[PDB]
Design a protein. Structure first.
Ligand SMILES: [Ca+2]
Ligand SMILES: [Ca+2]
Ligand SMILES: [Ca+2]
Ligand SMILES: [Ca+2]
Length: 313
C-alpha cells in the first residue's frame, strides 16, 4: 500500500514478467523454464522454441549464482536479480543476425579470430593476440575455432559487445573463406581447418608455424621479431601463429601433427610438409635458417649475424 506510484509500477511490471516466465503458472521458475527464459529475445518477450541453443554449462552457471537459498528453483526475488544484472538479451533476433553478418566479413557464416580482431581494432580497441586467445577460450565453447551464432549471443549476454558497437561497425565483395590472411602480417589460428586453408592458399610460399604457449616468456620475446619477419619476407613466407594450449584442436596440432616439445617453436612447411624446424629465441639463427630456404631473398637481414653475411666476392 505505501510504496510510491513509480515503485508500485516497477514492481507490477517485474511481477508481470515473472508470471510470463512462469509458463505453467505454478507460481515459480524451474530449471527448464529458466532454460527458455535464457534462450529468449526482446527482454523475455520472444521464445525461440525451434530447438535449444544454450549450452548446459550456461544454465548450471546461471542457477549457481541466482538460486541463493539453494532450493533448485528461481523465486520472484531471485528473478529480479537476473533482470537487474542484465542477463536477458534486449535485442531482436534480426538485430543479432545483422550484427553477426556485419562481423563475419568473409561471409562464410562463422566468425574467426581474425574477424574478431578487425572488429575490436576498427572500433578503436585493438586487442593483442594473447587477448584474442582469451576471447576464444571464453566464447568458443565447442572448440570449433570459430564463433558460431549461439556463441556470439553470449558476447551480448555478458556485455562484451553492445548492439551500439555493431551500428558503429556497420557505418565503417566477400571471399566466402574460412580465413583470409592479411598480407605482411601473421595469422592467428584456432583450428586445423584454418591451418590447412592457409597452406592451400599459399602453394608457392613457405608457411612458418609459430608455436607458442600463453605463459611462455621466451615466446613473448619472439612476437615482435616475427611481426618484422612477416613483413620483410611477405613475398616468400606466410606466418601462422598458434597457441598450443588454446583449445582441443590446437593441443592436438601440437602433440600429434607437429610433436612440439619446446616453445617457441618455428616449423617451416613447404607444400604443407615440415622441412625446417627451430626452437627457441635465437633470432639470428631463425632468420638465417629461413633465408637458406629462399632462392632470392629480400635484401638485407632484419637480424644479421657475422656468419650470415657473404664475404666480399
Ligand atoms: Ca513454473
Ligand atoms: Ca532458489
Ligand atoms: Ca567468417
Ligand atoms: Ca565455436
Amino acid at each position: 500500500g505505501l510504496m510510491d506510484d513509480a515503485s508500485k509500477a516497477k514492481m507490477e511490471e517485474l511481477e508481470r514478467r515473472f508470471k510470463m516466465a512462469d509458463v505453467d503458472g505454478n507460481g515459480h521458475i524451474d530449471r527448464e523454464e529458466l532454460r527458455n527464459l535464457l534462450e529468449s529475445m526482446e527482454s523475455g518477450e520472444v521464445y525461440m522454441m525451434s530447438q535449444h541453443w544454450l549450452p548446459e554449462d550456461e544454465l548450471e552457471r546461471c542457477m549457481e549464482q541466482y538460486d541463493v537459498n539453494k532450493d533448485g528453483v528461481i523465486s520472484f526475488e531471485e528473478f529480479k536479480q537476473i533482470i537487474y544484472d542484465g542477463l536477458l538479451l534486449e535485442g531482436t533476433l534480426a538485430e543479432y543476425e545483422s550484427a553477426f553478418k556485419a562481423v563475419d566479413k568473409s561471409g562464410n557464416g562463422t566468425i574467426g579470430a581474425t574477424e574478431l580482431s578487425k572488429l575490436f581494432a576498427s572500433l578503436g580497441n585493438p586487442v593483442s593476440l594473447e587477448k584474442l586467445v582469451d576471447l576464444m577460450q571464453m566464447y568458443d565453447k565447442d572448440d570449433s575455432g570459430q564463433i558460431e551464432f549461439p556463441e556470439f549471443l553470449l558476447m551480448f549476454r555478458n556485455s562484451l559487445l553492445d548492439l551500439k558497437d555493431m551500428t558503429t561497425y556497420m557505418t565503417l565483395g566477400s571471399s566466402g573463406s574460412l580465413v583470409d590472411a592479411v598480407e605482411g602480417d601473421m595469422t592467428l589460428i584456432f583450428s586445423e581447418e584454418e591451418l590447412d586453408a592457409l597452406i592451400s592458399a599459399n602453394p608457392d610460399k613457405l608457411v612458418v608455424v609459430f608455436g607458442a604457449l600463453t605463459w611462455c616468456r621466451p615466446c613473448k620475446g619472439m612476437q615482435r621479431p616475427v611481426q618484422k619477419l612477416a613483413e620483410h619476407y611477405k613475398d616468400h613466407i606466410v606466418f601462422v601463429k598458434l597457441f598450443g594450449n588454446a583449445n582441443k584442436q590446437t593441443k592436438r596440432i601440437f602433440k600429434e601433427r607437429f610433436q612440439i616439445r619446446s616453445t617457441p617453436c618455428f616449423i617451416t612447411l613447404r607444400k604443407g610438409e615440415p622441412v625446417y624446424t627451430q626452437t627457441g629465441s635465437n633470432k639470428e639463427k631463425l632468420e638465417a635458417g629461413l633465408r637458406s630456404l629462399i632462392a632470392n631473398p629480400p635484401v638485407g637481414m632484419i637480424y644479421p649475424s657475422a656468419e650470415a653475411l657473404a664475404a666480399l666476392q
